Design an enzyme around this catalytic site. Sequence first.
Site, PDB file in Angstrom:
ATOM      1  N   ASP A  25      22.581 -14.060  20.832  1.00 57.78           N
ATOM      2  CA  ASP A  25      22.790 -14.345  19.561  1.00 57.78           C
ATOM      3  C   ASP A  25      23.508 -15.807  19.347  1.00 57.78           C
ATOM      4  OD1 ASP A  25      23.454 -14.839  16.966  1.00 57.78           O
ATOM      5  OD2 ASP A  25      24.620 -13.103  16.784  1.00 57.78           O
ATOM      6  N   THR A  26      22.793 -16.921  19.274  1.00 57.10           N
ATOM      7  CA  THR A  26      23.430 -17.939  19.298  1.00 57.10           C
ATOM      8  C   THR A  26      24.413 -18.508  18.141  1.00 57.10           C
ATOM      9  OG1 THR A  26      21.312 -19.089  18.455  1.00 57.10           O
ATOM     10  CG2 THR A  26      21.481 -19.136  20.544  1.00 57.10           C
ATOM     11  N   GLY A  27      24.332 -17.665  16.997  1.00 58.06           N
ATOM     12  CA  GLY A  27      25.196 -18.014  15.923  1.00 58.06           C
ATOM     13  C   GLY A  27      26.533 -17.142  16.001  1.00 58.06           C
TER      14      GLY A  27
HETATM   15  C1  LIG Z   1      25.267 -10.229  13.589  1.00 58.58           C
HETATM   16  C2  LIG Z   1      23.874 -10.950  13.358  1.00 58.58           C
HETATM   17  C3  LIG Z   1      22.892  -9.821  14.310  1.00 58.58           C
HETATM   18  C4  LIG Z   1      23.395 -11.136  11.997  1.00 58.58           C
HETATM   19  N1  LIG Z   1      24.201 -12.328  11.550  1.00 58.58           N
HETATM   20  C5  LIG Z   1      23.740 -13.509  12.234  1.00 58.58           C
HETATM   21  C6  LIG Z   1      24.887 -13.847  13.161  1.00 58.58           C
HETATM   22  O1  LIG Z   1      24.360 -14.765  14.352  1.00 58.58           O
HETATM   23  C7  LIG Z   1      26.284 -14.297  12.642  1.00 58.58           C
HETATM   24  C8  LIG Z   1      26.104 -15.892  11.932  1.00 58.58           C
HETATM   25  C9  LIG Z   1      27.363 -16.058  11.107  1.00 58.58           C
HETATM   26  C10 LIG Z   1      28.223 -17.315  11.743  1.00 58.58           C
HETATM   27  C11 LIG Z   1      29.360 -17.431  11.171  1.00 58.58           C
HETATM   28  C12 LIG Z   1      29.707 -16.670  10.112  1.00 58.58           C
HETATM   29  C13 LIG Z   1      29.068 -15.622   9.557  1.00 58.58           C
HETATM   30  C14 LIG Z   1      27.853 -15.283  10.086  1.00 58.58           C
HETATM   31  N2  LIG Z   1      27.400 -14.526  13.578  1.00 58.58           N
HETATM   32  C15 LIG Z   1      28.468 -13.594  13.592  1.00 58.58           C
HETATM   33  O2  LIG Z   1      28.608 -12.628  12.632  1.00 58.58           O
HETATM   34  O3  LIG Z   1      29.435 -14.081  14.554  1.00 58.58           O
HETATM   35  C16 LIG Z   1      30.493 -13.216  14.430  1.00 58.58           C
HETATM   36  C17 LIG Z   1      30.662 -12.810  16.197  1.00 58.58           C
HETATM   37  O4  LIG Z   1      31.015 -13.792  16.890  1.00 58.58           O
HETATM   38  C18 LIG Z   1      31.712 -14.602  15.760  1.00 58.58           C
HETATM   39  O5  LIG Z   1      31.567 -16.023  16.048  1.00 58.58           O
HETATM   40  C19 LIG Z   1      30.646 -16.220  14.699  1.00 58.58           C
HETATM   41  C20 LIG Z   1      31.246 -15.346  13.456  1.00 58.58           C
HETATM   42  C21 LIG Z   1      31.758 -14.004  14.446  1.00 58.58           C
HETATM   43  S1  LIG Z   1      24.195 -12.495  10.249  1.00 58.58           S
HETATM   44  O6  LIG Z   1      25.138 -13.824   9.537  1.00 58.58           O
HETATM   45  O7  LIG Z   1      24.936 -11.165   9.250  1.00 58.58           O
HETATM   46  C22 LIG Z   1      22.649 -12.811   9.379  1.00 58.58           C
HETATM   47  C23 LIG Z   1      22.168 -11.652   8.908  1.00 58.58           C
HETATM   48  C24 LIG Z   1      20.711 -11.733   8.439  1.00 58.58           C
HETATM   49  C25 LIG Z   1      20.014 -12.935   8.079  1.00 58.58           C
HETATM   50  N3  LIG Z   1      19.066 -13.138   7.804  1.00 58.58           N
HETATM   51  C26 LIG Z   1      20.924 -13.907   8.627  1.00 58.58           C
HETATM   52  C27 LIG Z   1      22.040 -13.915   9.211  1.00 58.58           C
END
Ligand SMILES: CC(C)CN(C[C@@H](O)[C@H](Cc1ccccc1)NC(=O)O[C@H]1CO[C@H]2OCC[C@H]21)S(=O)(=O)c1ccc(N)cc1
Lengths: 99, 99
Positions: A25-27
Amino acid sequence: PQITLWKRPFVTVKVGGQLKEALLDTGADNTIFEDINLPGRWKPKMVGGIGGFLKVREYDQVPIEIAGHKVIGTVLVGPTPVNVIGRDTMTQIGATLNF
Amino acid sequence: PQITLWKRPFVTVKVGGQLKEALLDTGADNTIFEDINLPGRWKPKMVGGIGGFLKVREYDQVPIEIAGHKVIGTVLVGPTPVNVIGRDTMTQIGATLNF
Ligand SMILES: CC(C)CN(C[C@@H](O)[C@H](Cc1ccccc1)NC(=O)O[C@H]1CO[C@H]2OCC[C@H]21)S(=O)(=O)c1ccc(N)cc1
Ligand SMILES: CC(C)CN(C[C@@H](O)[C@H](Cc1ccccc1)NC(=O)O[C@H]1CO[C@H]2OCC[C@H]21)S(=O)(=O)c1ccc(N)cc1
């Protein structure tokens, strides 16, 4: 490997010596698991995602292996709905996003 | 490009005629923007992430240009803390994870 994204990019990962699977998960900044029991003490940490915040247990110096690369990293354990490999771990194995 | 993951992988996008920035997110099934105004009919949807659910509007057949590549597909709009480009969009430009 070179992974397309038509399905969720799950990989097999051994974490703390336990065979699991998690989403590349690059996010995600951090690596988080919900379905592992790691040994020893942990420290409280918080993470923020799309729907708000979670309280997680932070465990340090945990061995992680993906696709033959073995690294030592931080693993969070918390109520994530899906295990995620974050950028912290992916930089260690030299993963890149390409297009 | 080849994008390393030492920092968050933001890219420039053009959507609704406007230049935006969004995170390339292989853990997101779908692309989501906050505060952008798209023409046409939408349908209400929910997305689930760490921390809970998010109410969004789903717009279909939206042109997006991602770092200069054109795609037509689904765009969700709602109060995400960060704009994300999800797999639905990234598959249209042939994005892959490599390690
Ligand atoms: C948890 C994933 C399977 C799903 N998420 C994408 C994810 O990459 C989010 C993307 C993201 C990024 C920032 C803020 C909210 C969501 N990242 C995230 O929650 O990361 C958390 C864990 O590491 C920390 O660093 C980033 C926040 C913490 S998500 O934001 O809930 C999401 C769900 C469905 C869609 N269509 C689009 C995005
Ligand atoms: C913001 C939209 C993407 C989502 N809307 C959800 C709704 O709760 C938003 C929640 C919302 C709204 C704006 C920004 C972030 C969140 N509220 C809202 O529109 O309130 C309006 C009335 O007061 C006005 O000033 C505040 C917003 C306007 S919604 O289109 O009605 C909707 C409702 C249910 C689902 N499942 C999907 C979407």
